[PDB]
Symmetry: D2
Amino acid sequence: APRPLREQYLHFQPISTRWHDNDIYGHVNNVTYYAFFDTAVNTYLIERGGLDIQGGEVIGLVVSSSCDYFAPVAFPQRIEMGLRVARLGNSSVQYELALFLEGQREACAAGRFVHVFVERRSSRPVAIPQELRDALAALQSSA
Amino acid sequence: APRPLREQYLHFQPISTRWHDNDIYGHVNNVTYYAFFDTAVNTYLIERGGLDIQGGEVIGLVVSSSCDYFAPVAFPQRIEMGLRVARLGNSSVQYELALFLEGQREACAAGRFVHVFVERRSSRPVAIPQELRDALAALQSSA
Amino acid sequence: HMATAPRPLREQYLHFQPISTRWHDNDIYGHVNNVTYYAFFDTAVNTYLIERGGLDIQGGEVIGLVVSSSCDYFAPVAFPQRIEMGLRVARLGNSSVQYELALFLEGQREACAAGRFVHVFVERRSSRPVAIPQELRDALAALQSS
Amino acid sequence: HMATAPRPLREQYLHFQPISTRWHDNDIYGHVNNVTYYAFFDTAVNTYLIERGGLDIQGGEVIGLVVSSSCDYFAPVAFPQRIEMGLRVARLGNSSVQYELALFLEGQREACAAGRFVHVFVERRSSRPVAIPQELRDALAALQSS
Ligand SMILES: [Cl-]
Ligand SMILES: [Cl-]
């Protein structure tokens, strides 16, 4: 089975839920979890890896992603992303994430996604800059 | 001129920003401010006024809204909604809100919106339930 | 029922644009969320600016920034209903413009929601207001109610 | 370039659906954000379930819940480009179904992104898995690659 626990992740981010996260069936819509993934990863890249989204030469593009869902959460509930790095490559990295509900031990959902690092003007993949590598390595998972 | 200050509002909510709040021009998109409005109002209605979004008999529908924007914010910046109630009617209420950037005194943006309270099944407007009125009145603005 | 402002009519608008509705346009109460309407406003205007004004959002030097907006809601709509935005230009200044929009059921004549927004155009890198470029102004001028 | 998985072809899909792009589909890097693709998946499937399966999202007793999904991205697209979702059903169980989708430029044949999701159908009030209702199953069956 699962399920994922908080101590299996390296870094955490609270994310506040918004009215419109819920859909017609009353819980956070599956699409929104990936917004959560994307937000946790890039928040980390900016505060700890020197990512410059406004004018930086090198950017992370999502080449792929996925998620399994174990139990719903709903606005206005309080949640938290665990983030870890499964592998750091030469020009890409695979993240693993998990959504946690405040007060619950087991993850509501767990997924992965993959960045490739490219030159912003051309979109040629490029070796990950060093400052970013240092930050990404600091997230290395245990398994 | 403006601009709005924090002490002119009754209740506050931090809202975390998400990767995708920024648009192609790099700042939080104007549309998202109203998601912020909607989130601050309904969060308050649920924790302090007994709003039951899942199964409640009475709901708030937005009959109108607006916003003026004074200066941009951007993900991953940290922000905060001030909320106040300009007037409580028999079956509607006008809220005033303002977006604040952490560390800035003056509001980035300020807007209003109007709820009408209806019966969920029929959508007949109905007098605001008492528990909700108590909470809404506790937000009354000074001017 | 909802906003008590008088409902605008299809004829009061110049230019129309279908927008396809999306699963999550509906919120928990089951109709399109009020915020999404503003996304419809942005999309209609900008689609118009790119196909008729020559707006270059990727590398253009002059951009349009939103300084205010508002909307009144008259009757709900829901995914997967088919909808259509009405657009016109109410006022055309040297560096700013006010748009008026209304959402229709593509099968219908009464507006379901209507509002307004203001663009100010600015040099992209600095954000100093510049005058509206002629190509865009020519496209805006074709939407001024005669 | 991006995902290195082999790109799916337009012919491998059964059913198509235009989706209009929106201003804020583009993120700060200027192309449609990866998350939005999944919104396109949800919309295509559900549009299909309502018009061909009789899904009643407002008051129906059986609903479809998403238990997993994934997507590979091959080439970016951008508002205001015109796009089209390809849909087919890969597997049809008693209470679950796996969909496969791909996004195309409506003018084009190579997929720009492709992925998958799984619906489990459940009694709406409880969320106990129920079998898929016959009307929906008949619509799902028409998408199984022959
Ligand atoms: Cl805009
Ligand atoms: Cl769904």
